[PDB]
């Protein structure tokens, strides 16, 4: 069980870690989150009380270092930092734990809510999408644009998701125009899986990271990427059976976790109706189709 301590909480803020969200008052005696499960990536996110504009946060893995949060009054945000002096961090953390100044990441008895959302998500792949090599953790916020968004403007602050474009030479073999556009299996299996991602686990990891960025930060380009990666599979007639079964599980838990009041904008009607009811895989996503029809029958 690991710990993300805080130097203090000078401004009133809603903090979230994964699916949990809690409020900290201005200058409240708050010094962090303990009992964070080892083995998973995590995200610690912020929304200030005064300016609900800009949700922001940090993806991290406690196995990669000792991370703490401190409010910067110049830049006006809570910053993640790394403390390399392990003995000092241990002392700072023991101090806070003895004074009971930390909230407790709960352990729930039948709970796989976070694992199922982050199964294929790896810190090393996050760090290639979010390029800031001097830190072991990755900052994301509501406004960051994707590489593909910038092709249609600060490169350092971009989300370098794999570009997917159904009307592109990469997607369409000369001489197979109709074939490749109506059945995207070539583009899925040879261009993307074998060529770019190398395996379906890395594909699913980027799909899961995109969803989580879209959901926790309202990153429009993350939402675009998540739906593009779903649509590329559903629009492929030839998909390995294990991938379809895992996609169904992935999407089920994403749809399950989605706040009901954000579905209106977080779900793209066209993609989901095409995916569930018109595509090659219309009959391959039983769990996802069942939860969608019972939770969001309006979209369909």
């Amino acid at each position: 069980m690991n710990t993300v301590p805080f130097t203090s909480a000078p401004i009133e803020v809603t903090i979230g870690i994964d699916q949990y969200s809690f409020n900290v008052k201005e200058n409240q005696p708050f010094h962090g989150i303990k009992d964070i499960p080892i083995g998973h990536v995590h995200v610690i996110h912020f929304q200030h009380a005064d300016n609900s504009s800009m949700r922001y946060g940090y993806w991290f893995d406690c196995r990669m270092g000792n991370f703490y949060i401190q409010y910067d009054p110049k830049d006006g945000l809570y910053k993640m930092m790394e403390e390399r002096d392990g003995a000092k961090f241990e002392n700072i953390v023991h101090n806070f734990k003895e004074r009971q100044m930390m909230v407790s990441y709960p352990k729930i008895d039948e709970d796989d809510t976070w694992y199922n959302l982050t199964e294929f998500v790896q810190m090393d792949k996050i760090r290639k999408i979010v390029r800031k090599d001097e830190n072991q953790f990755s900052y994301v916020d509501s406004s960051m644009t994707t590489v593909q968004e910038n092709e249609l403007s600060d490169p350092a602050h971009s989300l370098n998701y794999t570009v997917i474009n159904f009307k592109s030479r990469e997607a369409i073999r000369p001489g197979h125009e109709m074939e490749d556009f109506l059945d995207k299996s070539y583009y899925l299996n040879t261009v993307m899986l074998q060529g770019i991602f190398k395996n379906s686990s890395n594909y699913f990891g980027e799909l899961q990271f995109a969803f989580l960025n879209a959901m926790f930060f309202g990153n429009y380009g993350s939402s675009l990427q998540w739906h593009a990666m779903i649509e590329l599979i559903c629009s492929s007639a030839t998909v390995p059976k294990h991938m379809l079964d895992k996609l169904d599980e992935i999407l089920y838990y994403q749809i399950k976790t989605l706040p009901e009041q954000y579905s209106d904008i977080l779900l793209n009607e066209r993609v989901w109706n095409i995916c569930l009811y018109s595509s090659f895989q219309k009959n391959s996503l039983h769990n996802t189709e069942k939860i969608m029809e019972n939770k969001y029958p309006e979209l369909l």
Binding site: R169, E177, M178
Partner: protein, 237 residues
């Protein structure tokens, strides 16, 4: 963007453009089978690809053999159209290639865009106009070459005959669209109007009769009467 009445004179500026109409590519007769079921039999079709400034018509004849053993023919027809338009463009010298291709039906946009990925600087556009190019097979000489074809064939025509010697391309296109709208509305009457007087001849190298300027005004007036009269009865207007 989309082409409509507001940007109508753009058709006659000096950027090369082509209209593409696919409505006569896949053509069938529907008939009964010996068992009392229904079947289709394909007949030859054509892509109507037209430069509205010059009158140059690239009539790609679509022979029924292209459908043999194929499924989902109405979908295939759109892709075949886009394949043939892309081949046409590639066959033209760079300085003759269009800057825009305007499709008469929106279902042609994605097939043409995908086939033209190599030409990112050719704009593929729809239109809000309800152009009557489907009636092109009511022009006797075009129908004849389509139905006689025994293999794939491209035939080149000027759909304006020699009109551009005496009128502008705006006026020529307006006359063409009036004639075609008339033929689409009431083919028999329209054709009677055109070919009732025997002294007026269609030259061997032309599609339409050799009307004097005065006769074209009468003709054009007669086509309008046919068309608004028939708009006339369609609605009780």
């Amino acid at each position: 963007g989309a082409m409509n009445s507001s940007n109508y004179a753009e058709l006659f500026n000096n950027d090369i453009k082509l209209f593409v109409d696919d409505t006569n590519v896949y053509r069938v007769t529907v008939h009964k089978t010996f068992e009392g079921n229904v079947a289709t039999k394909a007949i030859n079709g054509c892509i109507f690809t037209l430069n509205p400034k010059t009158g140059h018509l690239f009539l790609k004849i679509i022979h029924t053999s292209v459908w043999a053993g194929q499924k989902r023919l109405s979908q295939l027809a759109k892709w075949k159209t886009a394949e043939e338009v892309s081949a046409l463009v590639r066959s033209l010298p760079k300085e003759e290639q269009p800057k825009q291709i305007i499709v008469t039906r929106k279902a042609m946009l994605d097939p043409l865009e995908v086939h033209m990925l190599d030409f990112p600087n050719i704009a593929i556009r729809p239109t809000e106009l309800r152009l009557p190019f489907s009636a092109a097979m009511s022009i006797d000489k075009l129908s004849d070459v389509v139905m006689k074809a025994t293999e794939p064939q491209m035939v080149l025509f000027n759909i304006y005959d020699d009109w551009l010697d005496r009128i502008s391309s705006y006026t020529a296109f307006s006359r063409l669209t009036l004639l075609l709208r008339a033929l689409k509305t009431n083919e028999e009457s329209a054709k009677m109007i055109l070919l009732s007087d025997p002294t007026i001849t269609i030259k061997s190298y032309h599609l339409w009769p050799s009307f004097t300027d005065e006769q074209w005004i009468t003709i054009e007036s007669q086509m309008r009467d046919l068309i608004l009269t028939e708009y006339g009865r369609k609605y009780n207007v």
